[PDB]
């Protein structure tokens, strides 16, 4: 079935350059149009370019003409959008899509995105920080505990609770651009106060940008 | 560049609802409209092409139109699985444009926040900052107001909070006050205290620690 997968996506520094990719299955490139589709964090879905892989023409959108070249190669079956003179506007997850013509300009197959963060910042990882329950209050019901994941360039996280295995109450929230240019987030957890020290919650913080995987295990307090 | 218009910008309504969003192409597009749909952090999907005909998979409470230079996305029977953003797009000449979205959030009987503070833990404060978080817990309406009293005194801008997209199950939002600030100014205050305004409480919960390191 026709799929269409992207990448190559990453931290570029301004005025670097990139190559995005596109590969599509199920179908041959050749009879279709390849389209590029980007949507910068928070906003709409912006064009940017699209090729017919047959002819070769092209067509760009104005913010983009000139400083990106989108190809084709059809023996590879693949699309590529080559990237020069990355700005910070550029920053944004990357689409690929088709045009099946054959009753529609519609663009039915899209992939899955890649996320181009384009940043002058140096990759840092999460400081992990436990929230801890019992803080003036020891009896209630329910408690609640989490991790704080802290400072980290660029975007994703990924937190998990004792292993996959916490799936319930676990609220892991959007992660928030700080002053310092780096981000944070909280994933908490609400769990039983009879458990707690029956049981042992960690959380699991996965940065792949720095090739961080820190386990915290969060644990009570009295004050 | 034809510019599509799209509104409403979002909305609230219940299981069973019909619910119509439209899209004013500024120019005549002709029919060449399709329109999307995205469930957060997700491709986009096609649910009508050219106006009026649902793509192949799409469910039937689902429906477009055209009357002019209006277009219609219809859902009949709105369904909680709907939570999404619908995009639409005129496909007519180049470039392909798109709507500004519309998000459209189930709504249901105004539940109340569970507040819950959390001292900083001493590993930060050791690295020189603290940083003492609110939560709110399964709440609906998304709206609250938090809000930070340190001795009494409430702050300014240097607390920074998070919202959960609603629940798929509860159809709840949750969400995050963090009040950051160093270890010294941290120090200098005795009482910290979070408080929750929101409906479904008459009145304000505050919660509150005296600070730490005890």
């Known amino acids: 079935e026709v799929q269409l997968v992207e990448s190559g996506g990453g931290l570029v520094q301004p005025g670097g350059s990139l190559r995005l990719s596109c590969a599509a299955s199920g179908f041959n490139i050749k009879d279709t149009y390849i389209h590029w589709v980007r949507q910068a964090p928070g906003k709409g879905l912006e064009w940017v370019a699209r090729?017919?892989?047959?002819?070769?023409?092209?067509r760009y959108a104005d913010s983009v003409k000139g400083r990106f070249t989108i190809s084709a190669d059809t023996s590879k079956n693949t699309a590529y959008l080559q990237m020069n003179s990355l700005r910070a506007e550029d920053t944004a997850v990357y689409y690929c899509?088709?045009?099946?013509?054959?009753?529609?300009?519609?663009?039915?197959?899209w992939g899955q995105g890649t996320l181009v963060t384009v940043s002058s910042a140096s990759t840092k990882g999460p400081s992990v920080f436990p929230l801890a329950p019992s803080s003036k209050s020891t009896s209630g019901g329910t408690a609640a505990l989490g991790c704080l994941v802290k400072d980290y360039f660029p975007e994703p996280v990924t937190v998990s609770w004792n292993s996959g295995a916490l799936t319930s109450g676990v609220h892991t929230f959007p992660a928030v651009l700080q002053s310092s240019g780096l981000y944070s987030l909280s994933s908490v957890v609400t769990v039983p106060s009879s458990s707690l020290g029956t049981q042992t919650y960690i959380c699991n913080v996965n940065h792949k940008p720095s090739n961080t995987k820190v386990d915290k295990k969060v644990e009570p307090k009295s004050c | 560049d034809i510019q599509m218009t799209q509104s409403p910008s979002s909305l609230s309504a219940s299981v069973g609802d019909r619910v119509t969003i439209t899209c004013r192409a500024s120019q005549d597009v002709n029919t060449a409209v399709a329109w999307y749909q995205q469930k957060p952090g997700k491709a986009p999907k096609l649910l009508i092409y050219?106006?009026?005909f649902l793509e192949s998979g799409v469910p039937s409470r689902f429906s477009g139109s055209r009357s002019g230079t209006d277009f219609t996305l219809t859902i009949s029977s709105l369904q909680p699985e709907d939570f999404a953003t619908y995009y639409c797009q005129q496909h007519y000449t180049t470039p392909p444009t798109f709507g500004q979205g519309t998000k459209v959030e189930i709504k249901r009987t105004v539940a109340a926040p569970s507040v819950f503070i959390f001292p900083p833990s001493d590993e930060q404060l050791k690295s020189g900052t603290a940083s003492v978080v609110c939560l709110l817990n399964n709440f609906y309406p998304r709206e609250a107001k938090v809000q930070w009293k340190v001795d009494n005194a409430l702050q300014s801008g240097n607390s920074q909070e998070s919202v959960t997209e609603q629940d798929s199950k509860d159809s709840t939002y949750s969400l995050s006050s963090t009040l950051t600030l160093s270890k010294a100014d941290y120090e200098k205050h005795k009482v910290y205290a979070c408080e929750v305004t929101h409906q479904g409480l008459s009145s304000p919960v505050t919660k509150s620690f005296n600070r730490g390191e005890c």
């Open positions: 050219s106006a009026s």
């Open positions: 899509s088709r045009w099946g013509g054959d009753g529609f300009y519609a663009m039915d197959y």
């Open positions: 090729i017919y892989p047959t002819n070769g023409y092209t």
